[PDB]
Design a protein around this ligand. Structure first.
Ligand SMILES: Cc1c(C)n(Cc2ccc(Cl)c(O[C@H](C)C(=O)O)c2)c2ccc(C(=O)N[C@H](C)c3ccc(C(C)(C)C)cc3)cc12
Ligand SMILES: Cc1c(C)n(Cc2ccc(Cl)c(O[C@H](C)C(=O)O)c2)c2ccc(C(=O)N[C@H](C)c3ccc(C(C)(C)C)cc3)cc12
Lengths: 261, 259
């Protein structure tokens, strides 16, 4: 039980270090103060063109494309954040290297949607590391197939953010997603599930000591893993339609090499 | 706590009352126990066509097998419907909500209970008196050949938890009482009923499986594997309705597929 506190704090610390924009920092920005500087708001086409001028995005080499490709940049950015984090989970580095890769290959989408929930409200999502805020309505207004890209993630974020999880809770949750013993292609599932049994224990205790008035929060949190998986499925189906019916490229074939799987 | 033991006992009795073929019965048939009579195995044609003699058909071949397979499915929708009414609070909800909860829950319940009738080599049929092999089903002409295999793949993973009926009774309740279903008017009274069911399920597993860590959590993550075979199955329904348009889908099952 103290061992489990050690694990929960350890992961909280790794999560702080590995991820720039935490849920507290992001919640702050999304709702009035802490009133340092408001974010640039993109709400419509014209506010976008000024947003590229002002904020200055790292991914600028249409329009519904250019945003789609910002997500990809940021996703690939995030994957390295997630990989460094995975390496701090007790036992992860000592697993077979083939298993490590597999776990990350399948975990990362699910983890990206989880931490994206942290950056969203009902009305939009923080971009450029907190400097910006793109409206939900604007994203739903983009043409097919791009109008329906972001919406399944907002629908999710609304339900997930209602659980009112802290970063100390998310940190453990993230480690549980990564260590799923049912990913296709794993060679040695035993030690994976051992580690996950420990993370789940720690999550259940964390969840009790931190939210003792919210009954069965543990069970409700594990039920959202269903909703996570269904978003990765709805998203693979969309990448299908893009690679099928879009000149989603030109390209530097060296770019689409970077942004494949 | 005592009240959760009480809810658990109540739901177990409604399970036994509403389902003719329990897991425990299934398991006794599948092994070699003297409590139950060994099944007639069907592993190809002639075995099928000799199984016509030792019974039954339902009450071409891939058509005749899958038409009856749907008949047993309506019956199961009836058995599940009757079980659901026993769950404290369910019948007190909005009527619209009662149907929504069944519309999305039945498939998840059917495939959970179908696991009880299965091991890796095949599946119990005709109330336990036949057994049809996995390879035989897999040899059937496409698209029906690939119909049963996801079910087998889930079942083998799920039967690994070694749950028994007193555990399934509660779990099946939790499935039906999910507040995250499309088109529900008042989620909140549903979420409260589910909150009790999980509390009850938690205790039930800790008492009935004291040596197996995080079975509460391992079990709940299997709902992700169920949702997946439901979505895989409607994809396959679309294809069946176009290739073999000679085949009738029962209206109760018509209404359920619109999601
Ligand atoms: C991390 C992330 C964020 C912050 N957003 C919102 C968002 C919305 C719009 C823009 Cl222009 C954007 O980029 C800006 C410039 C930024 O954050 O700096 C970000 C996202 C929007 C969508 C996604 C997303 O769906 N990523 C999926 C999981 C994804 C897609 C494709 C890949 C591969 C590797 C296959 C290319 C991985 C992951 C991820 C994110
Ligand atoms: C409850 C159930 C059982 C016990 N099985 C195994 C099985 C396999 C084969 C037969 Cl012939 C069978 O029926 C016998 C006669 C019986 O009475 O038990 C049952 C099943 C196999 C499949 C399914 C299932 O997926 N049913 C869905 C609702 C379904 C949808 C659509 C169709 C068609 C092909 C008609 C479009 C069938 C079934 C359900 C079951």
């Amino acid at each position: 039980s103290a061992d489990l506190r050690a694990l929960a704090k350890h992961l909280y610390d790794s999560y702080i270090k590995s991820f720039p924009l935490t849920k507290a920092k992001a919640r702050a920005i999304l709702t009035g103060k802490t009133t340092d500087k408001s974010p640039f708001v993109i709400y419509d086409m014209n506010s976008l063109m000024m947003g590229e001028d002002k904020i200055k995005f790292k991914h600028i080499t249409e329009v519904a494309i250019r945003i789609f490709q910002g997500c990809q940049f940021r996703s690939v950015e995030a994957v390295q954040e997630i990989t460094e984090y995975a390496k701090s989970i007790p036992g992860f580095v000592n697993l077979d290297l083939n298993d490590q890769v597999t776990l990350l290959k399948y975990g990362v989408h699910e983890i990206i949607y989880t931490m994206l929930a942290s950056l969203m409200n009902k009305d939009g999502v923080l971009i450029s590391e907190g400097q910006g805020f793109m409206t939900r309505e604007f994203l739903k207004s983009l043409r097919k197939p791009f109008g329906d890209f972001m919406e399944p993630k907002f629908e999710f974020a609304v339900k997930f953010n209602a659980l009112e999880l802290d970063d100390s809770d998310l940190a453990i949750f993230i480690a549980v997603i990564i260590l799923s013993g049912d990913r296709p292609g794993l060679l040695n599932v035993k030690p994976i599930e051992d580690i996950q049994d420990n993370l789940l224990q720690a999550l259940e205790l964390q969840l009790k000591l931190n939210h003792p008035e919210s009954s069965q929060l543990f069970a409700k949190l594990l039920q959202k893993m269903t909703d996570l998986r269904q978003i990765v499925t709805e998203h693979v189906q969309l990448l299908q339609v893009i690679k099928k019916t879009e000149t989603d490229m030109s390209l530097h074939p060296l770019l689409q090499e970077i942004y494949k799987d």
